[PDB]
Symmetry: D2
Subunit: 299 residues, 4 copies
């Protein structure tokens, strides 16, 4: 496998680079960054080897500037971390330029898949898909995957059940228009509504903590790096091994809502997004989902 | 952890012993079998130590006949595999009684040494769990059997294959007897949290064929190689892992039920159960649709018959 | 990867099939057997999948008879377990020739299909490796045997247990015949890079009893449970993992020795080898002390006698 | 196990916190830092939990300031990362202050083993041993472990053999007074001198790069965070599981080697649940004894000048 991290100098980028360098399937990792980043990245690589300690002697790491993207050729996936820190529309445009440029350059080199993490992730995935000309199945963004994971952990801790028993999600925007799918939330297969303890669940407090998670972690340490990297590693594993798991990622929706990249349920595999799962949403859910889709169409 | 396998001389016992010795928490493994088996049980041990190749030097494996069960003291879990095989000329009741004597005697002897948790694999597993509980006098949380765990796993894998999704995305179960009275719970089956009944390929699910294959798996594998040993041992390994790490998972096991379902009482049957360090932490009660509860009560009656006949 | 176990219906064959099926580098596992075992193998397959419980969806397990060997094509390794047990009343030569027929015919057929590597488990492992390489027409780098790998592992674990160090710190070998003429190499035994001689406790080491047990293990385990199945399967798994990942470890295997040791030539015997994706990449040549080279000679002499009286059947 | 990382806000500290928190033998991890870093460390903890994604529910990470060390009680190991980025003496003394005070407070609160990551690691291990008053089997430092590992990987890459086949060690100071031990280097139990290709080995360039790695990575990214954290994790796993491996660490040496005396220096050691269970005594060749005694002299100088601050 050959993955290219564009923005490997970042926090999420370097965390994910180290995590991927350890997988047995990673054979050619490509760390890309602007020219002033090159030296820095050459250091990252150094340390990434110091950790492997000779275990992966068939592993190869490459460092190149964002000028000579010819090394991207034949990459299975290209993960884009490049972006700028925080008005909302101002940031949308500022980062849209970067991601559109990178997508355009990537498509010129090869027909690959694109994993967008930069924010606003849904609109950034829209811009990437447009400026790449790629098919709707080969471009996707992190979207509300991390928020859904946090929500799942919260529910599981409340109910005192193992993490694997809880299956839920949060579709919508990676923002405040989130739409928790309580209709598609189950414990061991049971709908959560058939538990009596569901009436005691602090729903608003949980969802508010999830909405504010980025704010809190920015206030404390200046941004999340480890957890996002772990989630991205898991998504890459879902792709390379053709695992066909039902994730929640920002994808192009058309009738499943239309002409918008929003956080929806998706079956991920070797061929990227193989399916956008369309399911019946209760009334409030579908209303709020439409609202989130409007806000996301804005940018 | 200190696990004891009574009947480790057998197929399932040997497989389970090998798989448990490989675990990082298995610090003392106790292999019990009748006296004529002692030498064989030593062989097993030797081979296991050959497989580890020194990777676990803190591991002790013991071999003792079923006469001197004092080596069981302080065991976390005692897995009972010892049992007689079904044969032509045996009614279901013949097997129930013949194996009830065995499991009941072993459970009474176990209770005489220590206060531990008993994991019944011997068949008819639901009835044998009932008998182990009766003769051991342990609490309703310390005795349980495999039951429909494996059948539920097979059903889950089948559904996942049909929908072409990862196995971890499918959550389903089969309650009732480890037998033809099985009751798959299609009401509490989901793919990614979505009920399967919302998917449009559900009307295309060959559910009848899947259920037939699950019910007949035992006969098929006995026809081919005389019995199942690898898969049952893997499932038992994961149940023991659920216990030792207090993972609090929602498994499907043969547990004692008293009212948690409508009209199920004084019976060991395959039900949903939250399993952790203290055994059966909870028997999950759930509203079954009309058909599910009708069939569940029928299976409960089938089990109650043999249970009544084996108590004394 | 795609491995083929020829004799999967046996103890070692089935244990190895189970262990290999769990590996994530196993896309195609091919279980071969005589026709009368096709259903037994099917049973095996079923049970294996049962134990996998749907974790491996891209994995495929095939079952076949030993007449349609076309399924063996593109296989990275072919393990040979097919072989007859020594029955009381069998001389060493008798077992040699009987199992020679089997391994040789399987090797010739393997060659007829495609070019692959051949991992001989069948005992007398050294002679069987010789016969397989004969009838395969393959290069010497693509045919090897388990040989004295297990015995070396047992010796190492014993030393480690006595010195109270982790297993990974001990680095020893036992070369030569997988038999009574074993050759423990105390000249090349170290504990933390430090030759075991330098350790004062090497005086107290019960060397003789340890080697006694290493040599008697076979009949000890045959007398109790009838034979070995777990340890050999684990060792075979390690060798296969070394091949697939080109780990380039220095193992101790039955390899063809052409003058790499003084006096040893045209014989398959237990030697140090550097194993990789291309098979035996190097037969490592090292300076034995006096007694060790003498014993290695004699062991090679015995193996050569057997390899000669059987080389044409 | 219950470990406590003093300096968890550092680079190495955070990397090690994340690696340890993933281990299943980690029931209680305690992240200690100065008061001004409290919020920061809290953030770290948050991130760590985010990376665990609910897998470790028996995991308990506690964050606290370096004033309320009461939480350190019952910790199996305490890893000290706190340090300052000057001459050599200047850094030695400045960090001796920090590590000595932390060792003394650790001793006040409870009894434990102290793993010194702070550099100059040999001198700092001496000062931890002093200000803690603990037994010598209880105070060690990373020392020349990483250097030995990089030397081993280089030999492995050259000879085209798996790393696990190479078994080498570098003893002495974590610095230019290093002493690569070619007398105790083997490749599969074969003395590497018996290999002919040893004569074509670029030995000196290898050793120079080993000496320069720290500065080289500091010239690019700021400092080492991942590799040191991995080696630390391996040493802690050897400690907790009583693995009985023969590592190369900074330990107190009292004549176990002919000439060495009252010096915390890098030597071969048998590590277990008891910390340094033994200093392995080896027969070195003339040149290696000479260089090792010189390294002892250097470290003794620094230790003498930082003995009472
Ligand atoms: N749930 C989610 O969807 C999550 C979203 N994210 C988002 O992903 C992005 C990455 O975050 P993080 O890695 O912490 O960010 P950092 O600020 O730490 O890294 C920024 C990266 O972008 C590059 N970069 C910055 N400005 C430009 C520019 N003008 N042109 C090109 N490249 C540029 C930097 O390169 P250089 O070294 O040259 O400055 C560096 O690679 C953020 O937008 C973040 O919000 C991440 C976490 C979670
Ligand atoms: N899904 C499920 O619930 C499964 C249930 N099972 C059941 O578990 C049991 C074990 O099966 P399996 O291991 O294949 O069977 P085996 O016959 O291979 O082994 C059972 C062991 O029981 C012991 N035993 C036999 N007779 C007696 C006796 N009279 N008194 C005491 N001990 C006796 C023997 O060991 P020793 O001589 O040392 O006492 C024997 O090795 C069976 O009843 C089987 O049906 C197994 C497979 C799956
Ligand atoms: N340390 C070592 O190197 C070890 C070596 N071995 C050796 O490996 C071999 C396998 O042992 P084990 O698995 O216990 O023995 P088994 O007899 O249980 O298995 C060997 C298989 O060979 C096949 N076979 C037997 N005769 C013939 C024949 N005439 N033609 C074709 N196939 C035949 C059979 O499968 P089927 O009927 O389907 O063909 C049989 O199951 C033995 O020779 C054993 O000595 C094993 C243990 C350790
Ligand atoms: N091979 C080896 O032996 C290696 C050793 N090291 C050594 O480990 C140490 C840590 O390096 P690194 O993590 O990059 O350093 P950082 O500066 O990134 O972190 C060290 C931490 O020390 C604390 N600190 C700083 N000054 C003081 C002070 N005056 N009093 C108390 N605490 C203080 C700070 O945390 P807070 O504010 O919370 O106290 C700071 O985060 C260095 O000395 C380095 O040389 C590093 C890697 C390799």
């Amino acid at each position: 496998m050959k993955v290219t991290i564009i923005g490997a100098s970042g926090r999420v980028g370097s965390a994910t680079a180290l995590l991927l360098a350890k997988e047995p399937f990673m054979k050619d990792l490509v760390l890309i960054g602007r020219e002033h980043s090159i030296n820095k990245l050459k250091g990252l690589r150094m340390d990434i080897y110091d950790a492997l300690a000779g275990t992966r002697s068939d592993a190869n790491i490459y460092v190149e500037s964002d000028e000579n993207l010819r090394i991207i050729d034949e990459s299975d996936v290209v993960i884009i971390t490049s972006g700028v820190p925080r008005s909302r529309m101002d940031l949308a445009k500022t980062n849209a330029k970067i991601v559109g440029n990178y997508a355009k350059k990537i498509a010129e080199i090869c027909d690959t898949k694109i994993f967008v993490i930069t924010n606003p992730v849904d609109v950034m995935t829209y811009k990437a898909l447009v400026e790449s000309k790629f098919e709707k199945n080969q471009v996707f963004g992190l979207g509300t995957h991390l928020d859904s994971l946090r929500f799942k952990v919260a529910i599981a801790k409340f109910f005192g059940v193992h993490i694997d028993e809880v299956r839920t999600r949060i579709i919508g925007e990676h923002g405040d228009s989130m739409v928790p799918l309580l209709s598609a939330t189950s414990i061991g297969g049971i709908p959560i509504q058939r538990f009596e303890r569901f009436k005691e669940l602090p729903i608003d407090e949980i969802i508010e903590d999830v909405k504010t998670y980025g704010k809190q972690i920015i206030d404390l340490k200046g941004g999340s790096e480890f957890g996002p990297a772990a989630a991205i590693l898991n998504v890459v594993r879902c792709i390379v091994n053709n695992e066909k798991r039902l994730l929640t990622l920002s994808a192009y929706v058309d009738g499943e809502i239309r002409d918008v990249c929003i956080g929806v349920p998706v079956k991920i595999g070797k061929d990227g997004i193989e399916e956008v799962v369309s399911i019946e949403l209760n009334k409030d859910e579908i209303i709020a989902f439409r609202k989130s889709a409007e806000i996301i169409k804005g940018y």
